[PDB]
Design an enzyme around this catalytic site. Structure first.
Site, PDB file in Angstrom:
ATOM      1  N   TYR C  26       0.818  -1.201   0.000  1.00 37.63           N
ATOM      2  CA  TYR C  26       0.000   0.000   0.000  1.00 37.63           C
ATOM      3  C   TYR C  26       0.858   1.260   0.000  1.00 37.63           C
ATOM      4  O   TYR C  26       2.089   1.213  -0.028  1.00 37.63           O
ATOM      5  CB  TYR C  26      -0.953  -0.013   1.198  1.00 37.63           C
ATOM      6  N   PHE C  36       2.547  10.008   4.620  1.00 39.60           N
ATOM      7  CA  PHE C  36       3.016   9.678   5.954  1.00 39.60           C
ATOM      8  C   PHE C  36       3.594   8.278   6.086  1.00 39.60           C
ATOM      9  O   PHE C  36       4.446   8.075   6.950  1.00 39.60           O
ATOM     10  CB  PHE C  36       1.880   9.870   6.974  1.00 39.60           C
ATOM     11  N   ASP C  37       3.191   7.323   5.247  1.00 41.48           N
ATOM     12  CA  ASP C  37       3.753   5.979   5.311  1.00 41.48           C
ATOM     13  C   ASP C  37       3.512   5.282   3.980  1.00 41.48           C
ATOM     14  O   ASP C  37       2.554   5.584   3.269  1.00 41.48           O
ATOM     15  CB  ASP C  37       3.150   5.176   6.487  1.00 41.48           C
ATOM     16  N   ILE C  56      -6.136  -1.226  11.607  1.00 35.57           N
ATOM     17  CA  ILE C  56      -7.238  -0.316  11.903  1.00 35.57           C
ATOM     18  C   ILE C  56      -8.505  -0.808  11.198  1.00 35.57           C
ATOM     19  O   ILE C  56      -8.445  -1.547  10.199  1.00 35.57           O
ATOM     20  CB  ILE C  56      -6.859   1.131  11.519  1.00 35.57           C
ATOM     21  N   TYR C  82      -7.979   6.101  13.455  1.00 33.12           N
ATOM     22  CA  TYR C  82      -7.461   6.335  14.803  1.00 33.12           C
ATOM     23  C   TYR C  82      -8.240   7.376  15.605  1.00 33.12           C
ATOM     24  O   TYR C  82      -8.162   7.361  16.839  1.00 33.12           O
ATOM     25  CB  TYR C  82      -5.996   6.745  14.719  1.00 33.12           C
ATOM     26  N   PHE C  99      -5.591   5.749   1.487  1.00 35.07           N
ATOM     27  CA  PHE C  99      -4.614   4.691   1.272  1.00 35.07           C
ATOM     28  C   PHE C  99      -4.674   4.202  -0.169  1.00 35.07           C
ATOM     29  O   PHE C  99      -5.732   3.779  -0.641  1.00 35.07           O
ATOM     30  CB  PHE C  99      -4.850   3.522   2.223  1.00 35.07           C
TER      31      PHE C  99
END
Lengths: 128, 903, 107
Positions: C26, C36-37, C56, C82, C99
């Site tokens: 992903y 961010f990631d 999550i 979150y 995502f």
């Protein structure tokens, strides 16, 4: 050797400008003639810079320095020092034999390494 | 607050040199169509997703410089308002991706077809994916500039341009009224694929620094002749009204007599046996006297140009004769030369130039007339569709047709010269085609500051491929990027376009080079001398001096510098490889000089003056403009006053100025669904923010623009008006009409101060300062403006997550020009809660030190990457067209400034 | 809860059900557009056991709809993300997560 005699004979210097002033030598056409062919006061009468001996020297100097190896400049400056001490041609030859092994080293400086490459790469440079 | 870093792939753009645009009386058809064939696409060659977009772009500001830039790098098609892009799922424009409904929507996968439809009659750009229409079209976009195909791609792609006809077949049926794009190629050039305006192209021996590319303009496709109506016909011209017509009645007929096109008594002109050399009396009367008054029309063009006649010598009528040659013999009423005969007569170069522009003014009138009858240009001739391959202005015409037009009128002016009447050249007026963009002319190239030298003797080469305005020499580390070399003391450069040396002025030195020459520059920090050697020969000044400059102070040091004019190519050889040097042994090796980069591993980091406007704070020592921070008193809010220091004095600086605040305001993440004291219960909840600007007395509001700008505004126009504001509307609907989403996007949100003044008879210099206010509602995206406390009609709506910078565009016309007021009004929250998170619930306005006023510097320094994307472009064949291939990956880590949204 | 937009769909036949691990490669991004990631930076696929609530809720419920070799853009509200507590030091409170998931393989 002509310039050596000019540099040492004071009367040669003294009557160099006497020949210049009596012949009204401009000294600029002898250097800028090709400049005019290429379409391009303070020292009007005479000056040391306009002399033909050094005028020839500045053109000969790359040619003369071309033969000398890159390991020999270090000998040239110390030769300038001993020549400043007024050592004759025989004496400076003996001093060269006294310090032949003091010449430059190929790995002694990175500036010398490319000089070896561009000096030794010429066809006319013989290792013997 | 903290700068962000990330690995980003390099992205390059490739275009075909097919340029189209519309203008008043344009000679270019406004509907076009092309396609892009996708062969192979690597979904993820590197960590970042592969970039691949298709669409149009604008020729006057779409400059995707490789490396960092707007947003998060990799800028291509659609990252700014100078281009519009479609990548299979988004209609990219203004660096915002908007999804569009498609019949089986997906990214650009292998074996896919992207069709582009352009209409300039109405503003519209349609898209088709695999032949299936895309339910979204751009409208209400700027027409100025030219539109060209372009593909923006990262590494790992293989795309092919389908241009139809000979360069493909479009694999489909183009929509009616839309012409194939291969017809737009100008005849003087041949179709090829080249990247966008760049600064480096690879060469056999090394990279070639490339000066700005000359760009064709839409204004260069309108034929603008000199009007030939308001000219009273002179007596000396009506006196020679006949012979100059008789000599051009069958001059076009003279060539083909005694050939297959040999005349016959039964027929006349235009019947494949045209000549009819007898006379024009036998020929039809209307075209006959038309030819007479066309000879008169050419003489009227001579008048309007500035040609006048005078008679001195023997009358040519006596010493001229008609020659019944064995060739051109005819049976129809005797034989004679088809035009009127002439003996030995010559022509001077003044007459050559004059007949050149005379043919120009003939061609441009013909083209103007054809356009007025509806015709347009197409590289293939279509008579029923009323298109011609020669409907371009003379300057853009081909040399064959240029010569063919010039031959006839050259004979005409020769016949005029034979009679001894002078062809008088007019006065000479020097003119420049483009003047505004003085900065897109010189691209200064130099080395990085870490390579600065303060000692020793240094050598480098500069092969001048072309012979234009290119300057090479040495410059100080703090060399300004927007100032030409030699204007100040920060440059010691030799301009060898015409043999001049530049340092705090210009004086002649040496001789100009030619193509292929090598300029070996010297520097001697020990002896404080600078020499320039051309082809191994020491250049000379206008004296016996062998040194261009002398007695130069060491200073901060010097750098190897060069600059190039428009359409110029120059190879810089800093000396990384000693063998690559051509004249080092001839000059430099025997006199103690060394190459600049003699002992270095990596290529010298070379910095180029990047000619793209950016926003930077005002220097504190600026002689013309100063910004004063006035403290907020009990009754006055904090202000940023801008005052012109040298206004009204000699040698002042007066030009269009762009001002902005250093901090943006970002609209809310989600928009909402569907005495004189601020009430605490509602002022803590309001989302409306207001700022005002005080246009001082003596400052004319007619040249004041007030509003907001998005951080991608890089439009530096000295004659700026609301027309030049970049904007585009994207409409989305279902398969059959039903426009349900019409989104308007723009980079500049300005209003004109001249619409906020009462138009009195006289007294435009109002004694009362104009206080224009601006209100923005972050929760809804709607923003308005107030003239003097009353709301105005103009309003704007923006999409969420949009950044706006407080900006004022103004031409200074007084000692005190403007004043940014960070005030507040009844139940309206100041900007301190719209720019600072910690000051969200602080009602009292403040002006913290971070917020400061910025100018728009036109040219700023940048760094050229040590490696560039390798693009393989070639013509695959007649059936396929042109193929673009790029597989080698290149990744950069870019530091991103958040508030300015640029990396 | 989650909005899925297909990007490069694969077969659309076989879905990751309960019992087998889900291997996604992903790329995560905040709603403001700042990444961010990702997993391509680490160059290792993210293998997570389905149904164990280790990931999550938004990601878990999203991952079922894509098929093998299907790449989709998700959109997870803070409720299925979150939320108010956020991710300490990484994700700010009450943020919507997008995502660029690509279910490259199973097992």
């Amino acid at each position: 050797e002509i310039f050596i005699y000019w540099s040492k004979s004071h009367n040669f210097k003294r009557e160099e400008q006497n020949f210049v002033v009596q012949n009204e030598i401009n000294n600029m056409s002898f250097l800028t003639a090709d400049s005019k062919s290429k379409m391009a006061r303070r020292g009007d009468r005479y000056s040391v810079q306009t002399s033909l001996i050094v005028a020839t020297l500045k053109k000969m100097l790359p040619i003369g320095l071309n033969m000398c190896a890159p390991t020999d400049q270090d000998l040239i400056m110390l030769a300038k020092t001993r020549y400043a001490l007024k050592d004759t041609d025989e004496e400076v030859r003996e001093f060269l034999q006294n310090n032949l092994h003091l010449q430059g080293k190929v790995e002694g400086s990175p500036s010398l390494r490319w000089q070896m490459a561009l000096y030794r790469g010429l066809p006319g440079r013989e290792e013997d | 607050l903290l700068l962000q870093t990330n690995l980003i792939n390099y992205v390059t753009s490739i275009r075909p040199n097919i340029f189209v645009g519309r203008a008043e009386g344009s000679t270019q058809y406004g509907k076009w169509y092309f396609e892009v064939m996708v062969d192979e696409v690597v979904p993820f060659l590197t960590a970042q997703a592969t970039h691949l977009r298709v669409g149009w772009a604008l020729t006057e500001g779409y400059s995707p410089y490789p490396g960092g830039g707007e947003g998060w790098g990799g800028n291509g098609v659609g990252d700014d308002l100078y281009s519009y892009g479609f990548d299979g799922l988004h209609l990219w424009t203004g660096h915002v991706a908007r999804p569009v409904t498609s019949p089986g929507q997906h990214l650009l996968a292998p074996e896919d077809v992207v069709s582009c439809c352009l209409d300039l009659s109405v503003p519209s750009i349609s898209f088709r994916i695999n032949g299936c229409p895309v339910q979204g079209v751009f409208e209400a976009f700027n027409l100025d500039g030219l539109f060209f195909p372009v593909v923006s791609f990262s590494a790992g792609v293989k795309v092919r341009f389908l241009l139809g006809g000979r360069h493909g077949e479009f694999k489909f049926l183009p929509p009616p009224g839309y012409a194939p794009c291969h017809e737009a190629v100008l005849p003087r050039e041949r179709l090829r694929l080249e990247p966008i305006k760049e600064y480096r192209r690879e060469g056999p021996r090394g990279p070639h620094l490339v000066g700005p590319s000359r760009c064709l303009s839409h204004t260069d496709f309108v034929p603008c002749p000199v009007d030939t109506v308001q000219i009273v016909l002179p007596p000396h011209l009506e006196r020679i009204r006949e012979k100059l017509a008789e000599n051009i009645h069958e001059l076009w007929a003279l060539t083909r007599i005694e050939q297959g096109w040999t005349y016959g008594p039964v027929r006349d002109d235009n019947k494949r046996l045209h000549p009819c050399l007898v006379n024009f009396h036998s020929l039809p009367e209307p075209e006959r006297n038309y030819n007479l008054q066309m000879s008169g029309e050419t003489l009227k063009t001579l008048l309007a140009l500035g040609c006048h006649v005078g008679m001195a010598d023997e009358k040519a009528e006596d010493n001229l004769k008609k020659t019944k040659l064995p060739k051109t013999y005819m049976m129809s009423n005797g034989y004679k030369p088809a035009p009127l005969d002439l003996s030995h007569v010559r022509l001077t170069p003044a007459q050559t130039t004059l007949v050149d522009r005379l043919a120009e003014n003939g061609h441009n009138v013909w083209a103007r007339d054809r356009v007025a009858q509806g015709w347009s240009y197409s590289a293939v001739q279509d008579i029923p569709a009323r298109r011609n391959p020669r409907l371009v202005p003379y300057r853009l015409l081909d040399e064959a047709t240029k010569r063919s037009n010039r031959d006839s009128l050259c004979q005409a002016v020769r016949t005029l010269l034979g009679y001894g009447y002078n062809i008088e050249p007019p006065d000479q007026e020097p003119s420049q085609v483009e003047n505004q963009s003085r900065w897109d002319r010189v691209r200064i190239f130099r080395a990085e500051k870490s390579y600065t030298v303060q000692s020793g003797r240094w050598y480098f080469e500069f092969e001048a491929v072309t012979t234009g305005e290119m300057r090479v020499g040495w410059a100080r580390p703090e060399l300004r990027p927007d100032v030409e070399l030699g204007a100040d003391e920060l440059a010691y450069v030799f301009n060898g376009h015409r043999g001049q040396r530049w340092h705090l002025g210009s004086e002649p030195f040496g001789r100009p080079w030619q193509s292929g020459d090598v300029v070996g520059c010297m520097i001697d920090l020990t002896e404080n001398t600078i020499i320039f050697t051309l082809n191994g020969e020491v250049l000379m000044s206008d004296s016996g001096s062998e040194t261009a400059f002398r007695e130069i102070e060491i200073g901060d040091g010097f750098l190897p510098v060069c600059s190039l004019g428009p359409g110029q190519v120059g190879h810089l050889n800093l000396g990384q490889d000693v063998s690559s040097l051509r004249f080092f042994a001839i000059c430099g090796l025997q006199e103690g000089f060394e190459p600049f980069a003699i002992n270095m591993q990596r290529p010298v980091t070379t910095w180029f003056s990047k000619s793209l406007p950016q926003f930077e704070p005002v220097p504190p020592e600026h002689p013309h403009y100063e910004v004063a921070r006035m403290d907020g008193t009990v009754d006055t809010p904090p202000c940023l006053r801008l005052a012109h220091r040298t206004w009204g004095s000699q040698n002042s600086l007066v030009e269009m100025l762009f001002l902005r605040l250093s901090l943006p305001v970002q609209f809310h993440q989600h928009f909402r669904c569907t005495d004189n004291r601020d009430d605490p219960e509602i002022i803590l909840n309001t989302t409306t923010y207001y700022y005002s600007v005080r246009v001082f007395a003596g400052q004319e509001p007619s040249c004041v623009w007030v509003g907001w700008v998005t951080p991608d505004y890089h439009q530096h126009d000295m004659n700026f008006d609301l027309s030049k504001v970049r904007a585009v509307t994207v409409t989305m609907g279902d398969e059959q009409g039903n426009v349900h989403s019409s989104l308007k996007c723009s980079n500049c949100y300005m209003v004109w101060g001249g619409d906020f003044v009462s138009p009195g008879q006289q007294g435009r210099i109002s004694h009362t300062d104009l206080v224009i206010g601006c209100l923005v509602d972050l929760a809804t995206g709607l923003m308005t403006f107030t003239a003097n406390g009353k709301e105005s009609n103009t309003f704007f709506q923006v999409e969420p997550n949009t950044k706006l910078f407080p900006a004022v565009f103004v031409l200074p016309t007084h000692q005190n020009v403007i004043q940014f007021e960070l005030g507040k009004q009844k139940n309206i929250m100041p900007l301190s809660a719209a720019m600072f998170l910690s000051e969200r619930k602080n009602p009292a306005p403040q002006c913290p030190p971070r917020l400061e006023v910025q100018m728009l510097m036109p040219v700023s320094w940048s760094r050229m990457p040590n490696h560039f994307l390798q693009v393989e472009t070639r013509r695959a064949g007649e059936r396929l067209g042109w193929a673009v291939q790029c597989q080698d990956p290149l990744t950069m880590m870019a530091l991103h400034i958040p508030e300015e949204n640029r990396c | 809860g989650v909005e899925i937009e297909t990007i490069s769909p694969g077969d659309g036949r076989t879905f990751p059900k309960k019992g087998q691990t889900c291997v996604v490669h992903y790329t995560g991004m905040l709603q403001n557009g700042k990444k961010f990631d990702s997993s391509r930076d680490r160059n290792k696929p993210f293998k997570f056991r389905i149904g164990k609530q280790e990931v999550i809720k938004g990601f878990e419920e999203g991952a079922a709809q894509m098929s093998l070799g299907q790449r989709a853009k998700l959109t997870c509200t803070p409720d299925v993300a979150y939320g108010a507590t956020g991710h300490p030091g990484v994700i700010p409170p009450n943020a919507t997560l997008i995502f660029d998931v690509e279910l490259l393989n199973l097992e």
